[model samples]
Target: AKATTSVNYASNLDKRLPELPEGANRAQILESTWSTEFKVYDSFGEAHELQIDFARVPGEVNAWRATVNVDPTNADATATRVGIGTTDGVQNSFIVRFDNNGHLASVTDTAGNVTSPAGQVLVQISYNVVGANPDEAGAPTRHTFDVNLGEIGTSKNTITQFSDKSTTKAYEQDGYT
Candidate 1:
Protein backbone atom coordinates (compact mmCIF):
# COMPACT_ATOMS: atom_id res chain seq x y z
CA ALA A 1 0.00 0.00 0.00
CA LYS A 2 1.19 3.50 -0.80
CA ALA A 3 0.49 6.37 1.53
CA THR A 4 1.20 10.03 0.89
CA THR A 5 3.39 11.84 3.36
CA SER A 6 2.08 14.69 5.47
CA VAL A 7 3.78 17.12 7.82
CA ASN A 8 3.66 20.69 9.12
CA TYR A 9 6.03 23.61 9.24
CA ALA A 10 5.16 25.39 12.44
CA SER A 11 5.13 29.15 12.40
CA ASN A 12 4.29 32.06 14.72
CA LEU A 13 4.59 30.41 18.11
CA ASP A 14 2.77 33.00 20.18
CA LYS A 15 3.73 33.43 23.79
CA ARG A 16 1.04 31.72 25.83
CA LEU A 17 2.48 32.00 29.30
CA PRO A 18 0.47 33.97 31.79
CA GLU A 19 2.12 36.46 34.08
CA LEU A 20 3.02 34.57 37.25
CA PRO A 21 2.54 36.62 40.34
CA GLU A 22 5.71 35.12 41.81
CA GLY A 23 7.52 34.73 38.51
CA ALA A 24 7.38 31.71 36.20
CA ASN A 25 9.21 28.57 37.11
CA ARG A 26 10.67 25.95 34.81
CA ALA A 27 7.78 23.56 35.38
CA GLN A 28 5.26 26.31 34.82
CA ILE A 29 6.99 27.49 31.69
CA LEU A 30 6.96 23.96 30.31
CA GLU A 31 3.31 23.61 31.16
CA SER A 32 2.54 26.81 29.29
CA THR A 33 4.12 25.58 26.06
CA TRP A 34 2.28 25.58 22.74
CA SER A 35 2.08 22.45 20.65
CA THR A 36 1.01 21.13 17.26
CA GLU A 37 1.04 17.77 15.55
CA PHE A 38 1.02 16.41 12.01
CA LYS A 39 1.26 13.08 10.26
CA VAL A 40 4.32 11.47 8.65
CA TYR A 41 4.66 8.19 6.80
CA ASP A 42 7.18 5.45 7.40
CA SER A 43 8.76 3.04 4.95
CA PHE A 44 5.87 0.61 5.31
CA GLY A 45 3.28 3.31 4.73
CA GLU A 46 2.54 3.63 8.40
CA ALA A 47 1.25 6.97 9.57
CA HIS A 48 2.66 8.46 12.74
CA GLU A 49 1.98 11.66 14.52
CA LEU A 50 4.92 14.02 14.80
CA GLN A 51 4.41 16.49 17.58
CA ILE A 52 6.31 19.68 18.25
CA ASP A 53 6.17 21.69 21.44
CA PHE A 54 7.34 25.27 21.58
CA ALA A 55 8.02 27.08 24.82
CA ARG A 56 9.26 30.59 25.38
CA VAL A 57 12.73 30.81 26.86
CA PRO A 58 12.39 32.60 30.12
CA GLY A 59 13.93 36.08 30.08
CA GLU A 60 14.47 35.97 26.32
CA VAL A 61 11.94 37.81 24.22
CA ASN A 62 12.86 36.28 20.89
CA ALA A 63 13.97 32.80 21.83
CA TRP A 64 12.02 29.56 22.10
CA ARG A 65 12.80 25.91 22.72
CA ALA A 66 11.41 23.40 20.26
CA THR A 67 10.86 19.83 21.38
CA VAL A 68 10.23 17.22 18.71
CA ASN A 69 8.76 13.83 19.30
CA VAL A 70 6.76 11.11 17.62
CA ASP A 71 3.71 10.06 19.58
CA PRO A 72 4.78 6.72 21.04
CA THR A 73 1.28 5.34 21.16
CA ASN A 74 1.06 5.37 17.39
CA ALA A 75 4.73 4.83 16.60
CA ASP A 76 7.36 2.18 17.14
CA ALA A 77 9.49 2.42 20.21
CA THR A 78 11.87 5.30 19.73
CA ALA A 79 11.05 5.05 16.07
CA THR A 80 11.61 8.67 15.18
CA ARG A 81 14.29 11.18 16.01
CA VAL A 82 15.17 14.61 14.57
CA GLY A 83 18.37 16.56 14.26
CA ILE A 84 19.90 19.48 12.43
CA GLY A 85 21.67 18.91 9.11
CA THR A 86 23.49 15.55 8.98
CA THR A 87 23.17 15.02 12.70
CA ASP A 88 19.85 13.26 12.58
CA GLY A 89 18.84 11.52 15.83
CA VAL A 90 21.64 13.21 17.72
CA GLN A 91 19.10 15.55 19.29
CA ASN A 92 15.38 15.99 19.19
CA SER A 93 15.23 19.54 20.41
CA PHE A 94 16.70 22.94 19.50
CA ILE A 95 16.51 26.63 20.16
CA VAL A 96 15.02 29.06 17.67
CA ARG A 97 15.81 32.74 17.82
CA PHE A 98 14.31 35.73 16.10
CA ASP A 99 15.86 39.08 15.32
CA ASN A 100 14.65 42.26 16.95
CA ASN A 101 12.35 42.94 14.03
CA GLY A 102 10.72 39.49 14.49
CA HIS A 103 12.37 37.86 11.50
CA LEU A 104 14.07 34.50 11.77
CA ALA A 105 17.50 34.89 13.23
CA SER A 106 19.13 31.53 13.87
CA VAL A 107 18.73 27.98 15.23
CA THR A 108 20.93 26.13 17.66
CA ASP A 109 20.98 22.41 18.40
CA THR A 110 21.60 20.75 21.73
CA ALA A 111 25.27 20.32 20.85
CA GLY A 112 25.66 24.10 20.53
CA ASN A 113 25.86 24.00 16.74
CA VAL A 114 24.24 27.01 15.12
CA THR A 115 22.60 27.61 11.76
CA SER A 116 22.34 31.29 11.11
CA PRO A 117 21.78 34.07 8.52
CA ALA A 118 18.06 33.60 7.89
CA GLY A 119 17.37 30.71 5.60
CA GLN A 120 15.31 27.55 5.56
CA VAL A 121 16.59 25.36 8.37
CA LEU A 122 17.00 21.79 7.28
CA VAL A 123 16.03 19.23 9.90
CA GLN A 124 16.65 15.55 9.37
CA ILE A 125 14.12 13.00 10.58
CA SER A 126 15.06 9.33 10.87
CA TYR A 127 12.29 6.81 11.19
CA ASN A 128 12.62 3.15 12.06
CA VAL A 129 10.23 1.01 10.10
CA VAL A 130 8.44 -1.52 12.29
CA GLY A 131 7.12 -4.91 11.17
CA ALA A 132 9.00 -4.64 7.89
CA ASN A 133 10.83 -7.56 6.44
CA PRO A 134 14.39 -7.83 7.59
CA ASP A 135 17.11 -7.36 5.02
CA GLU A 136 18.98 -10.48 3.84
CA ALA A 137 22.27 -9.00 4.88
CA GLY A 138 22.70 -6.25 7.45
CA ALA A 139 20.58 -3.60 5.79
CA PRO A 140 19.36 -0.79 7.95
CA THR A 141 15.74 -0.48 8.99
CA ARG A 142 15.74 3.30 9.25
CA HIS A 143 14.78 5.85 6.61
CA THR A 144 15.31 9.57 6.64
CA PHE A 145 13.84 12.75 5.18
CA ASP A 146 14.32 16.48 5.49
CA VAL A 147 11.78 18.69 7.23
CA ASN A 148 11.91 22.24 5.96
CA LEU A 149 11.12 25.26 8.04
CA GLY A 150 10.14 28.36 6.14
CA GLU A 151 12.97 30.63 5.04
CA ILE A 152 14.28 32.57 7.98
CA GLY A 153 14.75 36.04 6.54
CA THR A 154 11.47 36.08 4.63
CA SER A 155 8.09 35.49 6.23
CA LYS A 156 6.12 34.67 3.09
CA ASN A 157 5.61 30.96 3.88
CA THR A 158 8.14 30.17 6.55
CA ILE A 159 8.47 30.63 10.28
CA THR A 160 8.08 34.13 11.67
CA GLN A 161 7.78 35.89 15.03
CA PHE A 162 4.71 37.95 15.80
CA SER A 163 2.24 38.74 18.58
CA ASP A 164 -0.43 36.69 16.89
CA LYS A 165 -1.42 33.17 17.98
CA SER A 166 1.11 30.46 17.28
CA THR A 167 -0.09 28.08 14.63
CA THR A 168 0.91 26.04 11.62
CA LYS A 169 -0.37 27.82 8.55
CA ALA A 170 0.44 24.98 6.12
CA TYR A 171 2.71 21.99 5.48
CA GLU A 172 3.98 19.84 2.62
CA GLN A 173 5.91 16.60 2.18
CA ASP A 174 6.90 14.36 -0.78
CA GLY A 175 7.15 10.83 0.65
CA TYR A 176 4.57 8.18 -0.26
CA THR A 177 4.27 4.66 1.05
Candidate 2:
Protein backbone atom coordinates (compact mmCIF):
# COMPACT_ATOMS: atom_id res chain seq x y z
CA ALA A 1 0.00 0.00 0.00
CA LYS A 2 1.14 3.57 -0.73
CA ALA A 3 1.04 5.77 2.37
CA THR A 4 0.90 9.53 2.02
CA THR A 5 3.50 11.81 3.55
CA SER A 6 3.14 12.66 7.22
CA VAL A 7 1.61 16.08 7.80
CA ASN A 8 2.93 18.63 10.26
CA TYR A 9 -0.07 19.15 12.48
CA ALA A 10 1.18 22.31 14.16
CA SER A 11 1.77 24.04 10.83
CA ASN A 12 -1.29 22.87 8.89
CA LEU A 13 -3.70 23.38 11.75
CA ASP A 14 -2.42 26.90 12.12
CA LYS A 15 -3.05 28.20 8.59
CA ARG A 16 -3.40 25.62 5.83
CA LEU A 17 -6.85 24.31 6.68
CA PRO A 18 -9.82 26.51 7.50
CA GLU A 19 -9.51 28.43 10.73
CA LEU A 20 -11.63 27.45 13.69
CA PRO A 21 -14.02 29.88 15.40
CA GLU A 22 -12.54 33.34 15.93
CA GLY A 23 -12.84 33.74 19.71
CA ALA A 24 -11.52 30.30 20.60
CA ASN A 25 -8.14 30.09 22.27
CA ARG A 26 -5.24 28.29 20.59
CA ALA A 27 -6.28 24.73 19.79
CA GLN A 28 -3.72 22.00 19.37
CA ILE A 29 -4.40 19.50 16.63
CA LEU A 30 -5.42 16.10 17.94
CA GLU A 31 -4.42 12.62 16.81
CA SER A 32 -7.78 12.33 15.15
CA THR A 33 -7.36 15.31 12.87
CA TRP A 34 -6.74 14.66 9.17
CA SER A 35 -6.02 17.81 7.17
CA THR A 36 -5.13 15.88 4.04
CA GLU A 37 -6.93 13.29 2.05
CA PHE A 38 -5.70 9.72 1.45
CA LYS A 39 -6.64 7.92 -1.69
CA VAL A 40 -6.20 4.27 -2.70
CA TYR A 41 -6.98 2.95 -6.15
CA ASP A 42 -4.91 -0.21 -6.10
CA SER A 43 -6.80 -3.36 -6.88
CA PHE A 44 -6.93 -5.20 -3.57
CA GLY A 45 -8.74 -8.09 -5.18
CA GLU A 46 -11.81 -7.23 -3.17
CA ALA A 47 -11.47 -3.77 -1.65
CA HIS A 48 -9.32 -0.68 -1.23
CA GLU A 49 -8.25 0.58 2.19
CA LEU A 50 -6.53 3.87 2.94
CA GLN A 51 -5.09 4.79 6.29
CA ILE A 52 -4.88 8.50 7.03
CA ASP A 53 -2.80 8.90 10.16
CA PHE A 54 -3.40 12.00 12.21
CA ALA A 55 -1.14 13.06 15.07
CA ARG A 56 -0.98 10.91 18.22
CA VAL A 57 -3.67 9.99 20.66
CA PRO A 58 -3.90 13.26 22.59
CA GLY A 59 -5.19 13.79 26.11
CA GLU A 60 -5.42 10.54 27.98
CA VAL A 61 -8.79 11.73 29.33
CA ASN A 62 -10.08 14.85 27.65
CA ALA A 63 -12.23 14.92 24.54
CA TRP A 64 -10.39 15.36 21.23
CA ARG A 65 -12.39 16.73 18.29
CA ALA A 66 -12.33 16.58 14.48
CA THR A 67 -14.97 17.44 11.88
CA VAL A 68 -15.45 15.99 8.41
CA ASN A 69 -17.48 17.43 5.59
CA VAL A 70 -18.10 15.04 2.75
CA ASP A 71 -15.80 16.07 -0.07
CA PRO A 72 -18.19 17.31 -2.74
CA THR A 73 -16.13 15.52 -5.36
CA ASN A 74 -16.93 12.18 -3.78
CA ALA A 75 -20.46 12.94 -2.72
CA ASP A 76 -21.73 10.04 -4.75
CA ALA A 77 -19.19 7.51 -3.54
CA THR A 78 -20.73 4.22 -2.61
CA ALA A 79 -18.74 4.14 0.61
CA THR A 80 -16.84 6.70 2.65
CA ARG A 81 -15.06 6.38 5.98
CA VAL A 82 -13.90 8.67 8.79
CA GLY A 83 -12.38 7.55 12.06
CA ILE A 84 -10.23 8.55 15.07
CA GLY A 85 -8.01 6.70 17.49
CA THR A 86 -4.36 5.85 18.23
CA THR A 87 -1.82 5.68 15.40
CA ASP A 88 -0.76 2.22 16.46
CA GLY A 89 -1.84 0.56 13.28
CA VAL A 90 -5.59 0.06 13.73
CA GLN A 91 -5.16 -1.16 17.28
CA ASN A 92 -7.28 1.25 19.28
CA SER A 93 -9.17 2.89 16.46
CA PHE A 94 -12.85 3.60 15.96
CA ILE A 95 -14.16 4.03 12.41
CA VAL A 96 -17.48 5.43 11.24
CA ARG A 97 -18.57 5.12 7.67
CA PHE A 98 -21.36 5.32 5.15
CA ASP A 99 -22.15 1.79 4.13
CA ASN A 100 -23.60 0.62 0.84
CA ASN A 101 -26.88 2.09 1.99
CA GLY A 102 -25.35 5.52 2.69
CA HIS A 103 -25.90 5.17 6.45
CA LEU A 104 -23.22 5.66 9.09
CA ALA A 105 -22.21 3.57 12.04
CA SER A 106 -19.48 3.09 14.65
CA VAL A 107 -18.70 -0.43 13.56
CA THR A 108 -17.47 -3.21 15.77
CA ASP A 109 -15.72 -6.22 14.34
CA THR A 110 -17.89 -9.34 14.39
CA ALA A 111 -20.85 -7.33 15.65
CA GLY A 112 -24.04 -6.84 13.70
CA ASN A 113 -24.76 -3.44 12.16
CA VAL A 114 -27.50 -0.79 12.18
CA THR A 115 -28.84 1.33 9.30
CA SER A 116 -29.67 5.00 9.51
CA PRO A 117 -31.56 7.29 7.16
CA ALA A 118 -29.76 7.94 3.91
CA GLY A 119 -28.80 11.43 2.73
CA GLN A 120 -25.98 13.94 2.47
CA VAL A 121 -24.72 14.00 6.04
CA LEU A 122 -21.68 15.88 7.29
CA VAL A 123 -20.07 14.12 10.21
CA GLN A 124 -18.03 15.32 13.18
CA ILE A 125 -16.39 12.60 15.22
CA SER A 126 -14.73 13.04 18.61
CA TYR A 127 -12.61 10.72 20.66
CA ASN A 128 -12.71 11.07 24.43
CA VAL A 129 -9.42 9.42 25.25
CA VAL A 130 -9.15 8.34 28.88
CA GLY A 131 -5.47 8.31 29.56
CA ALA A 132 -5.62 7.05 33.14
CA ASN A 133 -2.30 5.37 32.55
CA PRO A 134 -0.59 8.28 30.88
CA ASP A 135 3.05 7.85 31.74
CA GLU A 136 3.55 4.73 29.68
CA ALA A 137 3.56 4.76 25.90
CA GLY A 138 1.34 1.73 25.77
CA ALA A 139 -1.22 1.59 28.53
CA PRO A 140 -4.85 0.83 29.06
CA THR A 141 -7.26 3.41 27.66
CA ARG A 142 -10.94 4.22 27.58
CA HIS A 143 -12.16 5.81 24.33
CA THR A 144 -15.62 7.26 24.04
CA PHE A 145 -16.82 8.82 20.80
CA ASP A 146 -19.53 11.26 19.80
CA VAL A 147 -20.70 11.59 16.17
CA ASN A 148 -22.84 14.48 14.99
CA LEU A 149 -24.31 14.39 11.51
CA GLY A 150 -25.96 17.25 9.69
CA GLU A 151 -25.29 20.26 7.49
CA ILE A 152 -21.78 21.66 7.85
CA GLY A 153 -22.07 24.90 9.81
CA THR A 154 -22.00 26.75 13.13
CA SER A 155 -25.46 25.47 13.92
CA LYS A 156 -24.89 21.99 12.52
CA ASN A 157 -27.64 19.40 12.48
CA THR A 158 -26.84 16.71 15.05
CA ILE A 159 -27.82 13.06 15.05
CA THR A 160 -28.52 11.21 18.28
CA GLN A 161 -28.91 7.44 18.02
CA PHE A 162 -25.27 6.70 17.15
CA SER A 163 -23.86 9.43 19.36
CA ASP A 164 -22.77 7.36 22.35
CA LYS A 165 -20.94 4.16 21.49
CA SER A 166 -17.42 3.81 22.90
CA THR A 167 -14.57 1.32 22.95
CA THR A 168 -11.66 0.42 25.21
CA LYS A 169 -8.37 -1.33 24.78
CA ALA A 170 -6.15 -3.21 27.17
CA TYR A 171 -3.14 -1.17 26.07
CA GLU A 172 -2.71 2.09 24.23
CA GLN A 173 -0.47 2.56 21.20
CA ASP A 174 2.89 4.21 20.78
CA GLY A 175 3.04 7.42 18.72
CA TYR A 176 1.31 6.81 15.42
CA THR A 177 1.72 10.55 15.52
Q: What's the CA RMSD for each of the models?
A: 3.8, 18.8
**Backbone clashes under 3 angstroms, per model:** 3, 2
Error of 1 at 13 (Å): 1.1
Question: Where is model 2 poorest over a 10-residue stretch in terms of lDDT?
Answer: 168-177
Question: How many pairs of residues collide in model 2?
Answer: 2
For 1-177, candidate 2 gives per-residue lDDT tens digits of 322122111111111222233354546333234433322221111212222332222322222233222233433341223333222222223333323222232332112222234433322122212223433667433222223233211112322122222211112111131
Pairs with steric clashes in candidate 2: 60-130, 60-131
- Model 2 misplaced regions, further than 4 Å: 1-19, 22-34, 44-61, 66-72, 82-177
Overall lDDT per candidate, in order of appearance: 0.67, 0.26
Best by lDDT: 1
Which residue runs of candidate 1 sit more than 4 Å off their true CA positions?
1-10, 15-31, 74-76, 133-140
Residue 3, candidate 1: alpha-carbon lDDT: 42
